[PDB]
Ligand binder design. Structure first.
Ligand SMILES: Cc1cc2c(Nc3ccc(S(C)(=O)=O)cc3)ncnc2s1
Ligand SMILES: Cc1cc2c(Nc3ccc(S(C)(=O)=O)cc3)ncnc2s1
Lengths: 285, 290
């Protein structure tokens, strides 16, 4: 795919360009308004695994470099995860070969919304020291191949780098409890919803100590989302039946040995009401 | 200087891009029509050691990569020579690599257009003589772009020494009209002296018949090649190191009254018709008489 090639080329280019820039002791407000653009035009030269004409744009390289550092990701390991071996594809979504990272395509409007809140997000990551249930935004890019702009967003993978997820839920806490379609339920790993969760009498057995840490994190993250006037997010719930930042192991007493994976996902009826109902639903899980 | 920074950035970029491309078993005619262009536009980023806006163009990367190989220069050593340490600035726009193995000369857009028409003829010639020539060794051709100027840069193997300092310098043409270095020129540390200066100083090159035969055979072919391309107005660069690898160096003969190392190459080979046979014969009559 031309896009993945340009994307991998671009990540290698931007990290190498960053390798020359010393990291600043502080991010200035203009670093949130910053971008790096490269336009390649090869005439009769490279026609192999990479197109002759393309553009690549990295948004706020200083901001995302610092966010990576806060999330404990070295710039070199980030590059290796993304480029040493090709990423695998899902249904537009990719996972790094090592399963540590995830690359999601987003729209131009999603990028515009992400810019308005990038400073508020950075300030929040500083305050909670990278310890959050929110997506860890690691890179934001625009790849251009044959009059087609694709906006790519790199995030830490919420699911395991080794353990396979056996059951998947998208929890919202909506008053009208949504259900996965007939078409969805025939897949190997369907994304089940609230009504599916309730109908299956599913419970998460993690123990009061881990639950307290989880609920405190969630409450702040959701309060932060409400302050940004954000709604329609979900709790991604992954269950593994018997390096992982979002993983919580089954309590010693649990009737089933499981590893749960939980994070906030569609963060791009008013916000206050969304949150209370959201938090009421996953507190009862 | 923004230009040197963009140039060094670009050389590092193009060599790394070349490091991914397997070298072809043969150069196709399109490789002589080829180029690599990169346009950078950084907004509210960098601002230290490099410009926010710039363009870099490498002409015929496959042709110049192969020419380097023929001249026995590995792509990695070429990159190190040019970028590990900054090049020193001489006079024109002319730079020398830190290690003194390479030389970078600014040229004009017309010079580049002339160089393209003859790049295939030059490559064919280098193949025939196995990189053993008195001509400049063209290693890279680039166009560096900044806010108010487009600069065409040409990398060549340095004709002078990488260790030994040149004590006397000549630009020999064999011109019917007397060529002499000006008053202003002669007050410099290393003036470029000309034909009349050479003759007035009763200058001689003491090399020995064996080395002279190799030199004159090389020169005759190179000049025949230049004439075939309708080229004239070239010069023989003569460098003399007075005694207390260099490709163009020839040491003094055992019999010589002075121990010296001479450095000789063909240099202003970009001029054409707008007569070459007459130029060549007049020129060769002059340099054989040394
Ligand atoms: C199964 C998995 C999904 C997933 C995921 N999804 C996701 C994150 C953020 C957003 S956004 C840009 O709208 O905030 C949207 C989707 N992110 C990390 N790991 C995993 S694993
Ligand atoms: C003192 C020195 C000059 C010099 C030199 N000059 C030069 C070569 C080629 C041309 S061109 C593009 O018109 O062919 C013009 C000038 N080239 C290599 N080493 C040295 S050392």
């Amino acid at each position: 795919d031309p896009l993945v090639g340009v994307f991998l080329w671009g990540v290698a280019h931007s990290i190498n360009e960053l390798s020359q820039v010393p990291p600043p002791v502080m991010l200035l407000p203009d670093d949130f308004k910053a971008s790096s653009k490269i336009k390649v035009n090869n005439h009769l030269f490279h026609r192999e695994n990479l197109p002759s004409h393309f553009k690549f744009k990295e948004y706020c390289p200083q901001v995302f470099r610092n966010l990576r550092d806060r999330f404990g990701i070295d710039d070199q390991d980030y590059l290796v995860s993304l480029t040493r071996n090709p990423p695998s594809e899902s249904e537009r979504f990719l996972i790094s070969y090592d399963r540590t990272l995830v690359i999601k395509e987003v729209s131009s409007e999603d990028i515009a919304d992400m810019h308005s809140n990038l400073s508020n997000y950075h300030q929040y990551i500083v305050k909670c020291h990278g310890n959050t249930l929110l997506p860890q935004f690691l890179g934001m890019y625009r790849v251009s191949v044959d009059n087609e702009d694709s906006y790519m967003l790199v995030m830490r993978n919420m699911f395991s780098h080794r353990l396979p997820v056996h059951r998947k839920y998208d929890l919202k806490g909506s008053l009208v409890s949504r259900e996965a379609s007939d078409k969805e339920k025939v897949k190997e790993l369907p994304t089940l919803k609230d009504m599916d969760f309730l109908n299956k009498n599913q419970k998460v057995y993690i123990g009061e100590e881990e639950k307290k840490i989880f609920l405190e994190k969630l409450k702040r993250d959701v309060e932060f989302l409400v302050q940004l006037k954000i709604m329609d997010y979900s709790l991604l719930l992954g269950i593994h039946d018997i390096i992982d930042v979002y993983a919580i192991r089954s309590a010693e007493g649990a009737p089933q040995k499981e590893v749960y994976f939980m994070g906030l996902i569609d963060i791009l009826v008013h916000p206050e009401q969304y949150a209370k109902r959201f938090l009421d639903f996953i507190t009862n899980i």
